[PDB]
Amino acid sequence: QCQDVVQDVPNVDVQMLELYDRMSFKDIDGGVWKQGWNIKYDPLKYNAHHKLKVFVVPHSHNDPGWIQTFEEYYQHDTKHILSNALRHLHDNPEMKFIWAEISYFARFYHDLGENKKLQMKSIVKNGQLEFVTGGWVMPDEANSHWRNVLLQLTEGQTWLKQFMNVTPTASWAIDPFGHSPTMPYILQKSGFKNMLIQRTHYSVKKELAQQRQLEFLWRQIWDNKGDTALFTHMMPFYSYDIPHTCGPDPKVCCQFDFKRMGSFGLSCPWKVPPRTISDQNVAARSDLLVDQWKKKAELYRTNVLLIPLGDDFRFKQNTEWDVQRVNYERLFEHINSQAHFNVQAQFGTLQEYFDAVHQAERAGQAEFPTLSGDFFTYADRSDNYWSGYYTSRPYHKRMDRVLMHYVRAAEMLSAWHSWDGMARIEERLEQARRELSLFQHHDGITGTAKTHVVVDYEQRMQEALKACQMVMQQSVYRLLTKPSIYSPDFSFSYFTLDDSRWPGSGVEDSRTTIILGEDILPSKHVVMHNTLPHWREQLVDFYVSSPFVSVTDLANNPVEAQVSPVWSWHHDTLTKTIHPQGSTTKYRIIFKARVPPMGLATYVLTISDSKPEHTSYASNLLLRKNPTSLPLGQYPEDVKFGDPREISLRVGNGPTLAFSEQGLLKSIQLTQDSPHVPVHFKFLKYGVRSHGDRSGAYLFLPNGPASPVELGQPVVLVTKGKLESSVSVGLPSVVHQTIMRGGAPEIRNLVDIGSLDNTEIVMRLETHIDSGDIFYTDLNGLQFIKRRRLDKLPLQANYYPIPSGMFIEDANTRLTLLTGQPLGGSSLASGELEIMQDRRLASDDERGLGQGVLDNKPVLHIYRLVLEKVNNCVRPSKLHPAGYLTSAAHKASQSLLDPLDKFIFAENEWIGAQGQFGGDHPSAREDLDVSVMRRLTKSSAKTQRVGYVLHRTNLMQCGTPEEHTQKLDVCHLLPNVARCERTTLTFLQNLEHLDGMVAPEVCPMETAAYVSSHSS
């Protein structure tokens, strides 16, 4: 039934990897169309019986933060644009306008008086103002996780359905810096029929234009049948501004931007200004304009032409509305009345364009090509590849992934109950969703905003994290307290969250120590949550005020624990070394938590006078010349010292890892009998060019291949324990840590690029894997796409987004690096992987940001490193454009993105505490996730509704027998189900009423949404 996503290579007209292999990418001067050619057309193509229909679509690109904050732009610009759009559209019934960013629209609409709300609903209902996409933002497509792309889409569309009674089916993405097939994937599963994109490499625009392949049915790279296909229009020219949207010659098109005659402080850089249309010039002006249109029309297959009319924060002043409208009206009246042009031109909306294109298609006038692939890495001109923003502001890129998970966990934990309005649950979740959604903007997560705007996004996300914590901890208290005892104060913190990796050790001292003592408090309850729909074990760690602590479950069964010191690294400005200091007051206790699917498990930490039976203590070895003592208070094992030396470690039955005397991985041995496979971590630096174009927040313009970071004789700390071991080294700008818990290691880098101007720090893996020029990177955490390194392109063009993982492989061996944050990376030589850690750039890169990137701050990047044998795996053929993770790698990615949540009970005693929640939840097959669980109704609704987004990935078959797992029917997770419906992914349209109220599991690579309805 399900399509085979591995073994059937789709047949498409354009496959972007194949196209890339064949294209020459020459950057030649094409004439007035600088990156194209001199377009010719047959004037006889259009005639009385076959006219060119032209839709001029007014628009205004409104960034939710960039050079100003959201609120600053709203006050200075966007509120005036929307107020004037309302007035002008009301008064001019043929004028049209499209609007994309619902974050702004919702802010505006809720501030309007009722009379104006009604006026606004009227111009939407009548088709004059049309929403395009309808997301909270126009998101980045490179660094964004698909879950957050869906979150922001749902946030905007849910608002539009409720207030505007419309759901857009056409998408408009004119500004993201390159484009991802994750967008049509999500949009096509959310009711869309059409989409538009703009920022694709200039060589790609030229190639596709020459073949009239700028409109295409964009399907997923694994989709053999084509059911994922979404009609896509790629605009052909360098910009979406007016000079680059009327036709190929911006010197002509600029004369048709009537905001550029002087009084608005704008002009045409091509040195010919616009002139007011009059009866004396309209014929000449029309001849010039129609000629541009007919040239543009040559690049497409129908007789319906899209002419966007707008730019950034346009349509602000009433005088601007008038100057554009009246001048275009005079042109339309002339052109449409002059039969010799054979043109019918009018203001239109985006949906009107697409509807007319498909009318032409159905009339047999055109057939469209099929396409798969992506549109990274973008270059707008010459060698200016926009791969810098895959890394810029990495602190906030990491924060995005933390908040992603906290939103999911808060929505899921609170979904199990209906809450009184006084609990402020819906309020806090809406805030958290909206702040995370805002950050998906293409100047948010991308790291391309001004410093104070980055600060605003951070403050918003911090508030969202606090909102999630509040909702999560109220939910845990309710789920695990005997109901007749439960007595909530909705303002009280029953638990505090404990997060070991955010902001992280060395970033913020934010974690609470569990303070135990005979004279204060002998024990403490902690609770773990597992948002994934399968039973999960994971080591968890807490800070405690004594090393003499033991762990029990709530049935009072001992749980094996390990205590390690709390180590912090310090750049010692006196000794000029970077070295670790141990706490003599707090210690880390580590134990394996086992947690039900979408469930909770409670444990107890108890102090004793001396070493507990079931708690062991790690050894610690500090490798450095010239050591000094390292006291650890009550910690029972004395620190050992040694000169730097190679070391080997093995935890459990896991791999054996060998490290250099500099504390960097050099080899991995999977099993005791197997080989020591060379796998070498190295840190290098890229610089900036002293001549020509400089790297900045968008562009990566390295001054050649990276140079090794000079390491000196760094201090290496080795901690060896029964449950967890680690090697940590204080390198310049990076405290690098390899942590072993008995599977694939976890790597953590505390990255502080300090004051190193014009430097990008890269982490590289060097191996013996015969990968050649092939490597794989993911798109939005959804799919892995084959990449081919092209030596015909510059280094920066071979960088791709690494939103969640990357791998190289040969016939026998694969190395996969999973990430907890999006970063840029590549494989610049056979056997290598590399990923950028941070970048500090003194110069602006001439895209309008007007600053470098000099606001770096310490960030804790996290990874898992999975070396595997893959010779037995059923892989796609050599011609297939996708790749797929193994289960170990997929589970490793889940451990980074959706770890267990940890809660520490705040008060001294928890009366009515229970040991577990969710023990009866089905443990679903490992490839299935409940990406979203969200109650959709407030407590006043007689019929409660709960929405679920289910995602099935595809894992490679490598000969591990499939185990018994339980069917997950999300529609029966809550009792008293009365109806189960399959819906669009935004939950806004019912697609199927489900028999027996049973939600079927989805196919590999598919995502489905279901809503269950419950009598309450």
Ligand SMILES: *[C@H]1O[C@H](CO)[C@@H](O)[C@H](O)[C@H]1NC(C)=O
């Ligand atoms: C809005 O649009 C629908 C079509 O989806 C229309 O039939 C209905 O009358 C309107 N619904 C409202 C205002 O709730």
Ligand SMILES: CO[C@@H]1[C@@H](N)[C@@H](O)[C@@H](O)[C@H]1O
């Ligand atoms: C690259 O130029 C973009 C501009 N068009 C702005 O809208 C902002 O998004 C900026 O990043």
Ligand SMILES: [Zn+2]
């Ligand atoms: Zn923008």
